[PDB]
Paper text:
Nsp14 is organized in two functional domains: the ExoN domain at its N terminus, which interacts with nsp10, and the N7-MTase domain at its C terminus.
We determined the crystal structure of the nsp10/nsp14 heterodimer by multiwavelength anomalous diffraction (MAD) using the anomalous scattering signal of zinc. The crystal belongs to the space group P212121, with cell dimensions a = 185.97 Å, b = 189.74 Å, c = 195.93 Å, and α = β = γ = 90°, and containing four heterodimers in the asymmetrical unit. Nsp14 is a modular protein composed of two functional domains, bordered on their N terminus by two other structural domains. These four regions are organized as follows: (i) a flexible N terminus forming the major part of contacts with nsp10 (cyan), followed by (ii) the exonuclease domain (orange), (iii) a flexible hinge region formed by a loop and three strands (gray), and (iv) a C terminus N7-MTase domain (pink). Here, the N terminus of nsp10 is stabilized by the first 25 residues of nsp14, forming a clamp that accommodates the first 10 residues of nsp10. In the presence of nsp10, residues of the ExoN active site are correctly positioned and form a highly active ExoN, as judged by the observed distance between catalytic residues. The ExoN and N7-MTase domains of nsp14 are separated by a hinge region that allows significant movements between both domains. Sequence analyses show that amino acids forming the flexible hinge are conserved across Coronavirinae, suggesting that they play a critical and functional role in regulation of the nsp14 hinge region movement. Between the tip of strand β21 and the bottom of helix α9, a third zinc-binding site is found. It is formed by residues Cys452, Cys477, Cys484, and His487.
Residue numbers in the entry:
A (entry chain A): 3 to 453, 465 to 525
B (entry chain M): 0 to 131
Write the structure that this text describes.
Amino acid sequence: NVTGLFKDCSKIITGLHPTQAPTHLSVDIKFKTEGLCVDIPGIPKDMTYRRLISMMGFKMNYQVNGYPNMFITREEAIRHVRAWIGFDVEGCHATRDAVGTNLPLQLGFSTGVNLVAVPTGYVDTENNTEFTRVNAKPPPGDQFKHLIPLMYKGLPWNVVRIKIVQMLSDTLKGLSDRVVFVLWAHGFELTSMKYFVKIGPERTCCLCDKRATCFSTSSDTYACWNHSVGFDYVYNPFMIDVQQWGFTGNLQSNHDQHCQVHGNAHVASCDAIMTRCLAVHECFVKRVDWSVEYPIIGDELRVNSACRKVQHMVVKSALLADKFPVLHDIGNPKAIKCVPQAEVEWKFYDAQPCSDKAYKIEELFYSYAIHHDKFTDGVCLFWNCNVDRYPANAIVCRFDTRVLSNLNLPGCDGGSLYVNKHAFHTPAFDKSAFTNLKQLPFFYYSDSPCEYVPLKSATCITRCNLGGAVCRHHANEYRQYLDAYNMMISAGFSLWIYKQFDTYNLWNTFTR
Amino acid sequence: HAGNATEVPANSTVLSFCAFAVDPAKAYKDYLASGGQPITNCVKMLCTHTGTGQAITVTPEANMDQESFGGASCCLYCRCHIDHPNPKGFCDLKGKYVQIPTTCANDPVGFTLRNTVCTVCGMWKGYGCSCD
Ligand SMILES: [Zn+2]
Ligand SMILES: [Zn+2]
Ligand SMILES: [Zn+2]
């Protein structure tokens, strides 16, 4: 039929002289005959005019050979969290000189940021199209009266777009090489992007080699997130419309079903935050996908080897110390033993029992409410398997969500998405889950064979420590373990263990 | 909602792409090479077809060989409601009529991007120039 894109919102009651008209449909009926237009010199062209043009109605379906597609699949959105940034814009209505289109007023991001803009819009004139201030008003309702003060204050689009580039740059420069705007109803937000997004074939950053994420109109050049300073436009963005996945009611509804922290003020950024929150829940709270792998953005390899070295020492030692008959490995989707050479019966449990070797894992979602009396025999292992209250007979490792890093991103409730290798949604650290446990003190244990300045320590439990044996081999191994242990402590991980754990059970293997 | 509309869902995609592009000219050309259909809904003139061959004229001046169009509608930058590359920035085709070879009048907008006007005779180089 006819589109809404570029709707002339002007209160003018005539047409646009065949010469000043941009389209056939915009020409005044006074020059239209038998399907064509005709130059009637007695009806002269307009010397001057100003017609507000609606920029609502963009459709970005293009499939052009060298150009990236702005909208992405749910798969890519997940593949590239980090890059996710929530985006919601509150507008205002065109009103005196024109009417029938919305202008950006408050731009909200899933950072805490709210940028207020001068209501500007696109005006077609007799010579060119001008980008200028447009008369506007906040939407009619009562819940929109908070936008009345914002019709004053605010600032120039000159600025607002630089601020956006800067804001995104700071947020994303150590996380991704792109940006993915996370949208609820993409219409108006895509319109707002016209005001600060340019697109084209992929490019790379001046100086750097990374992907260009920004563009300077000032001097036709491109930038990554680390060099984009003074750059005014976002260059190739990506975006995802969350509601299009398949949702019931409004944003407020679906979000609050899965979250009690992000309170909704009527302000733009809250809707942005909530939008992201919801998307995270539908991809990361809906349990872990181990086939999706994420790249190293920094110092992950050192944390992971520390985590395993410690995991091994602690579980190895507790099994020798208290001679448990059974080890209940809760939270292991694979069939991998952290102490593969132990005599104990090793049972595996998980909510996502990997299909490839499904037979070795009992499907289970642990709840204290349910299983508090079920795993009585032996010891339970919860190494980054975050539950409700933990059972007294347990060895536990839990990530403190409050620790900031490039790996720890915001998530549901009060928790977070720890994205090391693979993405792990971790529920907020709750002190009372460890009621039944003891915080695990530092120790080192080795029953291995033995071999500028040496050190003595009481925490080194080794056959060569009964008074002077800095045993060069196990001096090193101790000092390395010590570093690994401290790595993971300061990396945010917390260790707890059954109260009966006693290092004399370990010393006793040597006092004999 | 008010307003008196402007465009046809045909141009809706083509235009969104060039509006957002860094280089609209390049974008449009690439778009067409990628199989997209050229911008339509232009201002085509009912004309005697007896006028001077000149490209940019005050009133319609088509030949039997040409068609006459309402200049602004043949200008990519006017159709996208974006900035013009004229450093001063006033469109050279708005408020005038544009003469386009019937053989090339399939794509008015592209035709004006792709071609150039002779400063001496006022006719398109290659499409009606008597110099050289
Ligand atoms: Zn939330
Ligand atoms: Zn133009
Ligand atoms: Zn000539």
